[PDB]
Design a protein around this ligand. Sequence first.
Ligand SMILES: CC[C@]1(O)Cc2cc3c(c(O)c2[C@@H](O[C@H]2C[C@H](N(C)C)[C@H](O[C@@H]4C[C@H](O)[C@@H](O[C@H]5CCC(=O)[C@@H](C)O5)[C@H](C)O4)[C@H](C)O2)C1)C(=O)c1c(O)cccc1C3=O
Length: 297
Amino acid sequence: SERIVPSGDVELWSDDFGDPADPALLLVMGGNLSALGWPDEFARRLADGGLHVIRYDHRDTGRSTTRDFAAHPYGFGELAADAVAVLDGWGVDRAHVVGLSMGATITQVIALDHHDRLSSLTMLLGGGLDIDFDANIERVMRGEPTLDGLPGPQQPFLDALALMNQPAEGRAAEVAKRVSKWRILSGTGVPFDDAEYARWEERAIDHAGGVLAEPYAHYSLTLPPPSRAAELREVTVPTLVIQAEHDPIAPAPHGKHLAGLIPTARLAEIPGMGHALPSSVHGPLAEVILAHTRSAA
Ligand SMILES: CC[C@]1(O)Cc2cc3c(c(O)c2[C@@H](O[C@H]2C[C@H](N(C)C)[C@H](O[C@@H]4C[C@H](O)[C@@H](O[C@H]5CCC(=O)[C@@H](C)O5)[C@H](C)O4)[C@H](C)O2)C1)C(=O)c1c(O)cccc1C3=O
């Protein structure tokens, strides 16, 4: 089912998968990605292990309140409170939360400031609050090292940004463009299927009322200060960090580093995976997340 949930001065679109009596699993997408960034088929694979899976559209994506950022600015504090508002909207006290990419940054903020709402934490395709990500994009482009000493974003990420700057006319061209972006980001380490990703994007576009433009408000976000990383030493819910082996945005050992900030963190690595969700990795991802959520309950 779906519902619109209130969160301060925004309304958030949300839907679910599985039995509402099973333990709650909240999926938190990356930057500028609506609910439909989590493929329906992945959400079902997870739900069919014994979970009530809930996903939603961040503000400025999908069917959630969309606004001129400059007139009404927000940060990760708001994004995290919004995730908790979705839990409120579905009557959920504590949830297994899963943060992907920019969403892993959000879930670190949840863990720090809404820790009481967590059964467990899972993060993937992401990195620690002490990683100055935006500054690091700037540094890699100028050939400077990162101040954290871990790998910055790699060539496929940059290639993906250059594609996004190229023009697409009409729905067919937009979908093709988006799929080419994902193909770049996913790499060749695991089987990538263009037809499936095209369908996922067609659904994402339909969900946005057929509008072809990607969300863009999240490019105006400012990251939490790196001082917040130190506070993760006080997190006590079971934490799982998943490293995609060939992640071009957050390469190894970002995952190991993120796990090293949280005393309850364990690290897993999906062989061959890039920064995308082809159905080739839905089985492996669901398996490790399910095993984690079971041990926390
Ligand atoms: C495009 C794919 C993507 O990068 C996937 C991803 C991955 C990570 C993070 C993201 O925010 C995001 C998401 O990132 C978004 C938002 C992100 N932030 C504002 C934080 C960033 O957008 C940027 C950073 C640039 O430095 C900035 O560039 C210039 C443009 C001209 C200007 O306005 C000046 C001030 O800034 C633009 C406006 O914003 C990237 C390019 O897209 C999407 C992270 O935030 C992140 C992290 O914080 C720590 C560890 C790892 C990560 C990530 O792996």
